């Protein structure tokens with residue numbers, strides 16, 4: 001159903017340089033926020049990613065995919081639907097986790113690599129796979145096609161959906177979309193995997209469809225006044241919160257239509273779908289408030 005994880009990023013350069021204190025500790029799957037009384041939260045996984053040298057507990061990109069990606073991918077081969085959301089403060093590690101860098105590929109490249117490896121393994125004259133990708137951006141409840149404002153009618157009228165046949169292919173679209181792309185919008189990478197089995201006369205005898213929606217959410221931080229985007233983002237994120245919580249609690253009412261994001265992903269949120277959320281947070285004292293907020297959001301969803 002619903003899996004919730006928290007990933008703790010390293011100190012950034014500024015925090016390192018300026019000796020900002022660490023206020024986040026971890027204990028197995030508990031997160032302890034020390035005051036800048038200690039607060040303790042429990043999750044399905046906690047990824048402590050502060051320092052590669054501490055092998056005893058460091059979680060690299062490979063670890064995140066093993067614990068959150070592999071299962072979600074398998075789910076799509078099973079013919080079911082799934083979403084993965086990265087949620088948290090700007091600079092906390094949402095994009096690093098979802099897409100990653102050229103040197104540290106994240107969830108999306110690993111998942112696509114795994115996907116094509118598996119399809120190329122199982123494909124033959126009697127069964128085929130069709131892989132289609134869309135990449136869109138939701139900013140202020142308006143949708144933009146990152147593979148080119150599209151109207152919401154639940155479908156996005158005129159949203160490109162492109163057939164890809166190799167990892168390199170699907171890579172050109174990751175690349176293309178990321179260029180055309182950010183901290184104040186949601187980015188949705190969608191894969192449709194269709195697996196068709198054929199009978200003796202080359203007619204269709206079996207077919208499974210699995211959808212994967214991999215989501216880099218808009219930053220969750222509160223804007224500070226020094227003389228609306230944040231408010232619009234808050235509604236969306238609050239609604240996504242209510243949807244995930246309600247599904248996690250599973251006759252209940254689920255408010256899909258209260259936001260463009262949750263409505264467009266209704267198909268992969270309801271039914272027998274699987275949802276995984278990674279709440280990214282800074283370890284540093286100067287982010288306590290936003291870290292605390294992110295932790296409560298993640299706790300609530302679980």
Ligand SMILES: Nc1ncnc2c1ncn2[C@@H]1O[C@H](COP(=O)(O)OP(=O)(O)O)[C@@H](O)[C@H]1O
Pocket residue numbers: 008009010012049088089090091092093094095096097101183219280
């Ligand atoms: N777990 C991590 N390990 C190493 N570097 C990270 C990690 N998380 C984030 N970073 C780096 O910190 C910066 C902020 O990450 P990013 O994902 O862009 O933040 P966000 O998407 O949440 O705004 C990026 O340069 C990213 O490469």
Ligand SMILES: [Mg+2]
Pocket residue numbers: 094095096182183
């Ligand atoms: Mg980002």
